[PDB]
Amino acid sequence: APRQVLDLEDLVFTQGSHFMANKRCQLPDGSFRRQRKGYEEVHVPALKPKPFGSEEQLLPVEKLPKYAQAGFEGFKTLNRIQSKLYRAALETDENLLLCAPTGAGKTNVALMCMLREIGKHINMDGTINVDDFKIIYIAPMRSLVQEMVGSFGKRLATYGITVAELTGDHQLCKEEISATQIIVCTPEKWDIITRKGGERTYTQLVRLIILDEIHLLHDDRGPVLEALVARAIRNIEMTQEDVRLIGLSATLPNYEDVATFLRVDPAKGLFYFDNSFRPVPLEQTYVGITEKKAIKRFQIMNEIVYEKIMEHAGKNQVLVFVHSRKETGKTARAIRDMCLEKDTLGLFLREGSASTEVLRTEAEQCKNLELKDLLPYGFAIHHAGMTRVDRTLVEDLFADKHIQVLVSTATLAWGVNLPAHTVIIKGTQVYSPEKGRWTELGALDILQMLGRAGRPQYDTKGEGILITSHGELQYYLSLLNQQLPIESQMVSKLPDMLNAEIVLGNVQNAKDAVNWLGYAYLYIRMLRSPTLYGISHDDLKGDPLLDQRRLDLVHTAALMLDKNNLVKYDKKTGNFQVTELGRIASHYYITNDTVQTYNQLLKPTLSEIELFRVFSLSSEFKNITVREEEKLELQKLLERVPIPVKESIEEPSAKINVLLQAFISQLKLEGFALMADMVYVTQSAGRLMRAIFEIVLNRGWAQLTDKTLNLCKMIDKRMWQSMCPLRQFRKLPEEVVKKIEKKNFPFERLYDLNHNEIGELIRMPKMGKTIHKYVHLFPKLELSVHLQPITRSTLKVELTITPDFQWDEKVHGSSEAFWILVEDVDSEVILHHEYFLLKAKYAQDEHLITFFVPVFEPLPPQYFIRVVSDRWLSCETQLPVSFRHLILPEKYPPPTELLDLQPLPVSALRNSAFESLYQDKFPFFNPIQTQVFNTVYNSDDNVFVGAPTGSGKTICAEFAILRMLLQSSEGRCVYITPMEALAEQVYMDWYEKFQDRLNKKVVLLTGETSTDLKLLGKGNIIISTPEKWDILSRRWKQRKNVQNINLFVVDEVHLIGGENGPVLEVICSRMRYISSQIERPIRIVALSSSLSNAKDVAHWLGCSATSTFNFHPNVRPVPLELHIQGFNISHTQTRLLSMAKPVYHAITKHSPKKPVIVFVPSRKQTRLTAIDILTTCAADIQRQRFLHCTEKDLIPYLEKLSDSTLKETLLNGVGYLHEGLSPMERRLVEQLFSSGAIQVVVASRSLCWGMNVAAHLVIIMDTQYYNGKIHAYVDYPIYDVLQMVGHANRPLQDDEGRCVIMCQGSKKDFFKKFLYEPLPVESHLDHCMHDHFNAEIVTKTIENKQDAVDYLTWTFLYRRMTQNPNYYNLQGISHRHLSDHLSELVEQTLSDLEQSKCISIEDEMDVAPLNLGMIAAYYYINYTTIELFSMSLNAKTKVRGLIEIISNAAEYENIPIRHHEDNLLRQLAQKVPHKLNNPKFNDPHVKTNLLLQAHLSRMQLSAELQSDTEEILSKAIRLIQACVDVLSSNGWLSPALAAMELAQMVTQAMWSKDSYLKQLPHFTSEHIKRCTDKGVESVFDIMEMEDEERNALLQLTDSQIADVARFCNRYPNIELSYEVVDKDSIRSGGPVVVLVQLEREEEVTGPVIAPLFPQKREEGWWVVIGDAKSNSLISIKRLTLQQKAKVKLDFVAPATGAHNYTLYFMSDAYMGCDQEYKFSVDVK
Amino acid sequence: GPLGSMTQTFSSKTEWRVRAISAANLHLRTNHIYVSSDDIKETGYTYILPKNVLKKFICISDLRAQIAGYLYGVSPPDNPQVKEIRCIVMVPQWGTHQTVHLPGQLPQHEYLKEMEPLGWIHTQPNESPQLSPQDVTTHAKIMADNPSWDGEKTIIITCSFTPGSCTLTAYKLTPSGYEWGRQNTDKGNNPKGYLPSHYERVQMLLSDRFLGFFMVPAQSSWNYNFMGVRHDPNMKYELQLANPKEFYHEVHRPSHFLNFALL
Ligand SMILES: O=S(=O)(NO)c1ccccc1
């Protein structure tokens, strides 16, 4: 509590890596100092290698583990370091710290650690599961990154490993992260990547992090390493996945603290090698100049270097290091022009040397100017501003010992392996734009440069010469002689680093933050050297763990963050609240002062002038000053800037403004300082201006959004808007585009023209074609719109994007990104926006985008839809969206008034049997049940009841069923509900009410056809989902049990408007049509949530206005108190974070004692939120409790579980429910919840339909979820939200229900509109017509096009077309308008079906079913699927082909695909009997091919792959039967028999080659071996055995022989007989009737036994007449067999003579029962 | 006598820069817009101007160089004495502090065909008791070339830059004003024959009840004050349904950018 606010600036080491903590410096033996005029020299002799140690020998590569030898291909043995290190590196997972001098071999130690990680993932086929793992190699300098990518790639190629740099911004380029196993990058790049976090990230796979040159800890960049390590190690804790860390360090003090910071065990993973292990001993020279005056000091420098250069001419190459691309040539010239002046140039190249000619030749062939000037003299330069091949030649010449003096910069030291015998660091001052001044070279650079002294093979010693200021001698002496301690620079960065952890949710309060700080290198250093870090030794003993000090640091930082609006900080609780501005600061790597400035100054009205000024005030620039010597050159620019600058040249912000504008305009400046400053400013501008763009975009600020996205693009492309977009094609000649610009005419005018007029208008014909191509390479999109009014104030927009340009990877890469911006009448507010990605693979297709926007009355004149490129300048299309002709739906009617009636007693049913179903549960029905009772129970009118979920509509339908049971003895009711989980719940309740308690038959349709067909005959209450009733009711003309229905009830009928609505609408329309045909009316009851357009549903279903009860949400019996909380954060993970505490606060405010359901977007989120709720409960002083049992009571329930976490959370009173829990787990959680034991349950969204628990308070935590197939977030359908809100309803327990919806702020108004008011629903049948039209042509209900129009008139679609024409793309409601609309619909649907050869059309009017269409309709198979089947199946496709064809059906296309299993399936395709053709593992069809083979091989897979196999299995049988029908009607005997066998194979889950006994319960392979070698090949052998020998061969328990007995007692034991009717008078071409009699030995005692198949099946059979020699199927009939049945097969006679046919009796459910009989017929 | 003692160097200070800085502050005036109370109080028609397009019109303007927009609108259903301004059309133009230069061609677009032309709106640096004679002449010459401009129904709305604000006044010509203006060739501030009986005030009202919209050129922008040579009284132009760019937007002054780029 008694905190203290610190001054962090006072604790900072201002000199960064130049901070020298050691007071003294001990020089090695033999060092000596020498005096000169104006400078001093310190000489340090080369060290001598250590005597070989205790038991040291250079490990030969042959003793390495064999899998690792390949990574050391081409080496004899490891060196001394690697030999000391290989056991720890290759044989343990121990975190390591290796300290060694530069060049000692640290990176090969790192390769050994890499190889150990790789060895963890060796497949049995010898390859590498390059998808199981990632490895991060953090290197400090980009040039080093690139070199490492190269060398590691080549060392690991033989393993099939991909090594890659992280290239550019990854808002579109993250894909290659999936293909890279070894990411090489800088600390900052890994920091920014792991700051964004999110899900679908690859950072979870990281198993090894190599931290190279970790003494960067001592640098100003060092805190990035601390952030990385703290974040990784702490992430280990909260996820239990290990990550190995490897640090590689220079040899410097505090390495043991570095080891503590990396969790290195000092006795296992710490290895320190002093400078005597340098590959080449180094002789060192330090030259410290004392002269203070600049000019004399400059000449002293040049003299010192020349004198040192002369000590080496003709004997030793010299590498000189300067700190400028420009100083390199200048000093090379100084030295060379000095040498010739003293006539010593001949000392570098001996006369007639072989190398003199090489230098002459390659100089004359080369094109670099200073390089040509220098090369003949033996000199050269090397830096980044030079060509790649220039540098490659400089390196080649130096390597072959041809160059004698090479002047170069730091980048050569990092990026090339180019050692020189002698190295001269000429001065140690460098210009730092960030610091705004000259400073000393960083430690890493100095070490690296001098590490280049001494070539490994060719030198016995190296010679490092360092020239600096005399006052720096102690510093450099210390750095290079193991005495510059590594300290922490992190106090300066603490606020930014803390904000990054807060944004991630890793740190949620000051206690979290103290814990996090305990992982920092700063903390170890504070513990060990407190006074260095501003802590007295007595404070340390008052605070031995620095708990108090850490809290003060965290407090200080959090206050700074709170003042700048990044965080909301509660000083009392210590809680941190994330904000969108804080997130933007973290994710864009912006310091916190800068986003405070942006937040303060950004306004929607901002001009471009002010935007440039705001940028120039960023705190990244705070050290920039306007130097006197610059003020002239800046004035001349400031006089002419195209963006006016308000402030004077005295202000640094004006200079930064002018440098930005000069950069965009590609101006060269003269000041060396000014150019470097411009580089710094503009390197930052990219991510700064993208941060501004995200701020203003998400605030909805249209004009400023446009200005700032443009400025981002102008910075990136280095040109202004007013230039010709053609400049962006770099290949074009700049002087041509300047011509085109000087011709003032619009760029768009070039679109109409062609080569001729193009080449003419620009007065240049030679380019007419060239330019013509580029203008069509330029990204361009065409836009069109379908406006779909939802209400009078909400509009659905369908936007079609049509690409209108030529794709070229050379210009467009693999994707092209755009912003879709919907703006208001004034172009002032962005009403809607979203990112749009045009992938190369779709560069020619139209894309559909749908969204909602508000409208108001009187309608505004128009909105605008802009589609703008994220990267191309002058690349946008804007579509005005005019409302002049928008037809709004009429305002909805007022609801049915809720009558104040006396509550109806149960005794009103006047029937004691009926009254016994309720009288215990309640004494009275609710007001709605009371008001509808008379119409439902006392009349036969069709009824509509519309009311909110939780109003007891189900009981109303029950009234109708009870009336049915009174007026009709064996009356039949069919009940439809749209969701399978609802059907199961209603079946459990109604079986109890109407069977257990009224002795009627209640049945639940299964999805297996004949099962359901007999259930329909038995039951008086048939419960079904829609598609299961669709397939049955299609056949109503042939099925009496469908038309003789008394009562048809449809529940949740408002889901006609949802995704699967068309089948619901079709079967309801069919029930009406059948009712009108049979003229014995089927009564219809429709139940629904409150509908604004209820009268339309009721009229469609023939409900009298007095019989339609259209209630609105206000009438819910248990009042609903609904709160909608908006959340401003646009990034989903961060927004979920901001909701975490509000969830807890909502519980304590709205339901502190009563049960709470929390709905969350995903399985993963359920446990995360359960744990978070518990954490917050523990730290709530008010003390709430959610466990209302004692621990003893929960213990037995606890044990019935396998999930550890669910056990812990349940013990503390919080359950969770998701799809991955076994059914027993879910039911136990629900038991505890409903019994009051646990007060909270956290359920995933996908479960909102099948929950059997209710609650006092429901919280909906966010309202979108990730769909991985499309890689995008999707909004919860309103239907699901209504279902979720409906769980807040306990009629017998509460006086109200409460619900809190937490959602993105932009969704809030939508939810107010569609939750406080009743719901408008529409049809989507017009989008789902083909399959139903095809069924109605099969059934002869549709026989011509007029029939099809008439059919449409029975639908809800037809009704809605007159009420909301625009929604269906009608522009009038005139009778001709919709007659034409319906005719168009009919023509399109019939023409597609005829194209697919499902129907035939005669005279363009009459339609008839073809065989394909009959098959599609009968089996409920998509017509596209059947068409493909028709193409693919052929006269010799077999089991392999059948599985392939069936997998490729459209019914499976939506089978989940997650690349998290790629290799899995890849390796599944090897353990698979049939090898697939050209396997692409990114396709759900081949995925299901593999899952099918898995099932047939009985391979146990994961739980998700198991449920997905169950889904595949629910459709496989229908698809296989369709294949059988196609094959047989084509005449192909062998493939049809095969497909029948496949039916058997998927039912019994085995192959043809497998053993029939493999069908028996409790058998394994060993039982089959014992059976095969003891006289048992088939099932029938087993019953023909005495008990003893059976049990002896069997080796099984007793309850298990009961199972084998059951299987044998139901295994089909048919025996067949056949007769050829009138076998004598057989004549060619005549009829041939074959009679087959089948008799089963016993009665069918139940369904097929097939425990590995999910649906219960009944036995199916085919009888087949074929000639096997011809491969000719001649006759086929299907049948189900009770006890005995006769079957007649009819076929045409052959040409004449004796013919031998074969009769087949084939099962579809069991292997091993197929019978076959040859017979002969003599055609005389 | 500084022949060789004191010598200074001229440093260019171009005027459009100060004007562009001041143009960035125009939004502040859109909160303080005043309409004058008519001295006539009765001239048949009351014009209702929607505030959204008025505020945009102010924001895209300049404090020295006049800009102008053409007015289109209709009468409310059963109220022919009221004219609601529904559209402001921006056409290629340039101006000075005293007048605006517009093409001879009047807006032609299908989307306007159900509206009637109601005259024009233009900004002015300073308020004034009387309608400018430049304005009388401009309006009379449009009328004389375009019979769709009814003298009894077309108005000039002046939008004057009063300190911290904008003040709007609406005028129409009289028949004598039309006759004098159509023959006036004197562009100065006091041409012979000009009289205050050449115009009269009309009732004007600002409204938040409905929204207006803009049309702008299809192939250019509307501002030619930096590209004067390319503007010609005879130039032809089409229109599109879109909102106009502000006065100092980049595409209105390309040569500033290119000439800096050559420096
Ligand atoms: O089906 S929807 O188009 N999606 O949520 C809908 C939205 C609001 C109201 C009714 C239907």
Q: Where are the domains of chain B?
A: 1-263
Q: Which two tokens stand for residue B247?
A: 């006065």
> Distance of CA B190 to CAs A9, A1301, B186, B194, Å?
70, 70, 8, 7
Alpha carbon B168 to its chain's center: 12
Those residues with Cβ within 8 angstroms of residue A1488's Cβ, 6 or more apart along the chain or in another chain: A1447, A1452, A1455, A1512
In this structure, what is the dihedral angle of CA atoms A705, A711, A716, A721, given to the nearest 10 degrees?
Answer: 110
Q: Do A667 and B86 touch (CB under 8 A)?
A: no
The amino acid present at A1712, given as its one-letter code, is G
Closest-CA residue of A relative to B87 is A861
Q: Residue B189: helix, strand or coil by DSSP?
A: coil
- Rg of chain B on CA atoms, in Å: 20
C-alpha–C-alpha distance, residues A83 and A70, integer Å: 17
Q: Does the distance separating the beta carbons of B24 and A661 come in below 8 Å?
A: no
Question: Is the backbone of residue A482 left (phi > 0), alpha (psi -120 to 50) or beta?
Answer: left
Of A979, A1061, A991, residue with least CA distance to A1004? A991
Chain A positions in Cβ-Cβ contact with residue B27 (cut-off 8 Å)? 605
Q: How many CB atoms lie within 10 A of CB A33?
A: 12
Q: Cβ separation of B242 and A640 shorter than 8 Å? A: no
On whether the CB atoms of residues A1400 and A1407 are closer than 8 A, the answer is yes
Instruction: Using alpha carbons, select from A472, A410, A450 the residue that is nearest to residue A283.
Output: A450
A1319 within ligand 1 shell (Cβ under 6 A):
yes
Assigned token pair, A1019: 């039951």
Residues A73, A70: Cα–Cα separation, whole Å: 5
Please state the atom number of ligand 1 nearest to the C-alpha of residue A1057.
1
In terms of DSSP bridges, do strands A422-426 and A462-469 run parallel, antiparallel, or are they unpaired?
parallel
**DSSP 8-state symbol, A991:** I
- Ligand 1 atom closest to Cα of A791? 9
Q: How far apart are CA A1469 and CA A924, in angstroms?
A: 63
- What separation in angstroms does the CA of A910 have from each of A914, A955, A958? 8, 16, 15
Q: Which CATH architecture has domain A904-1115?
A: 3-Layer(aba) Sandwich (3.40)
| Residue A1278 Cβ contacting ligand 1 at under 6 Å | yes
User: Is the Cβ–Cβ distance between B171 and B199 less than 8 Å?
Assistant: yes
> What is the largest distance, in Å, between two alpha-carbon atoms of chain A?
134
Ligand 1 pocket member A790 (CB < 6 A): yes
Whether residue A861 and residue B212 make contact (CB cut-off 8 A), yes or no, is yes
Question: How far is it, in rounded angstroms, from Cα A1216 to Cα A1251?
Answer: 12
Cα–Cα–Cα angle for A699, A647, A617, rounded to 5 degrees: 45
The count of other CB atoms within 10 Å of the CB of residue A857 is 9
**Token reading at A380:** 């050269």
Task: List the Cα angle A1048/A1049/A1053 in 5-degree steps.
Answer: 130
**Residues A1170, A1159: Cα–Cα separation, whole Å:** 11
Fold that domain A8-16+489-587 belongs to in CATH: Arc Repressor Mutant, subunit A (1.10.10)
Solved using: X-ray
Q: Name the nearest CA neighbour of A1059 among A1359, A1382, A1322, A1425.
A: A1322
> B15-50 burial, b for 16+ CB within 10 Å, e for fewer?
ebbebbbebbebeebbeebebeebeeeebebbbbbb
Pairing of strands A1297-1304, A1272-1275: unpaired
Q: Note whether A1254 and A1287 are within 8 A (CB).
A: yes
Q: CA nearest A1018: which of A973, A979, A981?
A: A973
Residue A1712: partners with Cβ closer than 8 Å, 6 or more residues away: A1556, A1559, A1578, A1579
**What residue owns the CA closest to ligand 1's atom 7?**
A1278
Q: Strands A163-165 and A134-138, how do they pair?
A: unpaired
Residue A1549, Ramachandran bin (φ over 0: left; ψ between -120 and 50: alpha; else beta): left
Beta pairing class for A1631-1640 and A1614-1620: antiparallel
Among residues A260, A252, A251, the alpha carbon closest in space to that of A233 is found at A260
Distance CA A795, CA A855 (A): 7
Q: Do residues A383 and A409 lie in contact, with contact meaning Cβ atoms separated by under 8 Å?
A: yes
Ligand 1 centroid–CA A1301 distance in Å is 17
A1314 ligand 1 Cβ < 6 A = yes
Q: What is the CATH number of domain A282-480?
A: 3.40.50.300
Q: Which helix (H) or strand (E) holds B200?
A: strand B199-201
Resolution in A: 2.3
Are B253 and A722 an interchain contact pair (Cβ–Cβ within 8 Å)? yes
Alpha helices in A968-1058 (DSSP H): 980-990, 1009-1018, 1026-1034, 1040-1043
Q: What angle do CA A1324, A1325, A1327 make, to 5 degrees?
A: 75
A chain contacts of residue B220, beta-carbon cutoff 8 Å:
746
Distance (Å, rounded) from C-alpha A261 to C-alpha A229? 8
Residues of B engaging A, defined by a Cβ cutoff of 8 Å: 11-14, 17-18, 20-21, 23-24, 27, 52, 56, 86, 111, 210-213, 219-220, 227, 230, 240-243, 248, 250-251, 253-254, 256-261, 263
Distance A1400 CA to ligand 1 centre (A): 38
Q: Rg of chain A over CA atoms, in angstroms?
A: 41
Closest chain A residue to B210, measured at CA: A858
CA angle (A732 as vertex; A728, A738 as ends), nearest 5: 80
What's the CA gap between A714 and A643, in Å, rounded?
13
Q: Check if the beta carbon of residue B139 is closer than 8 Å to that of residue B154.
A: yes
* Residue reference for tokens 């990026």: A415
Residue A952 among known ligand-binding residues: yes
Instruction: Please name every residue paired with A1160 in a beta bridge, in sequence order, or none if there are none.
Output: A1244
Buried b / exposed e along A350-370 (16+ C-beta atoms within 10 A): eeeeebbeebeebbeebebeb
Q: How far apart (Å, rounded) are the C-alpha atoms in residues A1256 and A1154?
A: 6
The C-alpha atoms of residue A1226 and residue A1242 are separated, in whole angstroms, by: 12
Contact present, A510 and A551 (Cβ < 8 Å): yes
Interface contacts (A, B; CB < 8 Å): 88
Distance from CA of B129 to the nearest CA of A (A): 32
Q: Which of A908, A1029, A1666, A1038 is nearest to A1340 (CA)?
A: A1038
A710: closest chain B residue by CA: B250
Q: Contact A180/A198 with Cβ under 8 angstroms? A: no
Give dist(CA B218, CA B211) in Å, integer: 22
Give the list of residues 6+ apart from residue A45 with CB closer than 8 angstroms, or none: A28, A30, A31, A283, A284
Distances (CA, A) of A1204 to A410, A1172, A1199, A1209: 55, 16, 10, 9
Asked whether A1277 lines ligand 1 (CB < 6 A), one says: yes
Q: Which atom of ligand 1 is nearest to the CA of A794?
A: 8
Q: Strand, helix or coil at A1451?
A: coil
A1168: which residues sit within 8 A by CB, 6+ positions away?
none
| CB neighbour class for A69 (10 Å; exposed up to 12, middle 13-18, buried from 19) | middle
What the block records as the tokens of A840 is 């190369």
Contacts of A282 (CB under 8 A, 6+ apart): A46, A47, A275, A450, A453, A454, A461, A462, A463, A464
Phi–psi pair at A1351, nearest 5 degrees: -50, -55
| Residue B90 distance to chain A (closest CA, Å) | 15
Q: What are phi and psi of A827, to 5 degrees?
A: 55, 40
Q: Are A928 and A945 contacting, i.e. CB atoms less than 8 angstroms apart?
A: yes
List the one residue out of A412, A148, A102 whose CA is nearest residue A273: A102
C-beta atoms surrounding A1055 within 10 Å:
24
Collapsing DSSP to helix, strand or coil, A204 comes out as helix
- Centre of ligand 1 to C-alpha A352, Å, is 89
Shared fold status for A776-882 and A1120-1316: no
Is A1242:A1160 a contact under the CB 8 Å cutoff?
Answer: yes
Helices A652-664 and A631-638: crossing angle in degrees, nearest 10, is: 60
Residue of B nearest to A644 (CA): B17
CA distance A1249 to A321: 72
CATH number of A1325-1416: 1.10.10.10
Query: Which of helix, strand or coil describes residue A774?
Result: helix
Ligand 1 probe mutation, A792, A853, A1281, A1314, most atoms within 8 A of CB: A1314
Under 8 Å CB-to-CB from B33, ≥6 apart: which residues? B51, B54, B55, B58, B165, B166, B167, B168, B206
Is A100 labelled as part of a ligand binding site?
yes
Closest Cα partner for A1348 from A1323, A1326, A1375?
Answer: A1326
> In degrees rounded to 5, what are phi and psi of residue B161?
-85, 85
Contact at 8 Å (CB) between A1159 and A1243? yes
> Cα distance from A214 to chain B (closest Cα, Å)?
45
Strands (E) located in A560-626: 567-569, 576-578
Helix and strand element counts for chain B (H, E): 5, 13
Q: Which fold has domain A61-277?
A: Rossmann fold (3.40.50)
A947 is in an annotated binding site: yes
C-alpha span between A919 and A912 (Å, rounded): 10
Q: Indicate the fold that domain A1120-1316 takes in CATH.
A: Rossmann fold (3.40.50)
Q: Which residue of B has its CA nearest to A856?
A: B210
- Inter-chain CB proximity A665 and B257 less than 8 Å: yes
Question: Per the annotation, does A953 bind a ligand?
Answer: yes
Residue A186: φ, ψ to 5°: -75, 160
Give A789's strand partners.
A795
Per DSSP, the three-state class of A1297 is strand
Cα end-to-end span (Å), chain A: 112
Report strand pairing: A244-249 vs A206-211.
parallel
Burial class of residue A448 in the structure, from the number of CB atoms within 10 Å of its CB (0-12 exposed, 13-18 middle, 19+ buried): buried
Interface residues from chain A to B (CB-CB < 8 Å) = 605, 607-610, 635-637, 639-642, 644, 646, 661, 665-667, 720-723, 741, 744, 746, 748-749, 825-827, 858, 860-862, 864, 878, 880, 882
The residues with which B123 forms a beta bridge, in sequence order, are B159
Fold of A776-882: Immunoglobulin-like (2.60.40)
SS percent in chain A: helix, strand, coil, step 5? 45, 20, 35
* Sequence letter at residue A955: I
Q: Is A1276 in the pocket of ligand 1 (CB under 6 A)?
A: no
What is the C-alpha to C-alpha distance for residues A1667 and A1691, in angstroms, rounded to an integer? 12
Q: First and final CA of chain B: distance in angstroms?
A: 35
- Residue of A1475, A1419, A1408, A1469 whose CA lies nearest to A1449: A1419
Identify the residue whose tokens are 């993932």.
Answer: A121
C-beta of residue A1442 within 8 angstroms of C-beta of residue A1524: no
Query: Which of the 8 DSSP states describes residue A916?
Result: T
Residue nearest to atom 4 of ligand 1 (CA): A1277
Q: CB B13 to CB A639 under 8 A?
A: yes
Query: Which secondary-structure segment (H or E) carries B169?
Result: strand B166-173
Show the DSSP H helices in A162-320 as ranges.
175-179, 187-196, 222-239, 255-261, 294-310
- Of residues A1337, A1451, A1449, the one with CA closest to residue A1390: A1337
Q: Ligand 1 pocket check: which of A786, A790, A1276, A1311 to mutate, most ligand atoms within 8 Å of Cβ?
A: A790
Distance CA A1591, CA A698 (A): 75
User: Which chain B residues are within 8 Å of A721, Cβ to Cβ?
Assistant: 250-251, 257
Q: Half-sphere exposure of A1697 toward its Cβ, with a 13 Å CA cutoff? A: 4
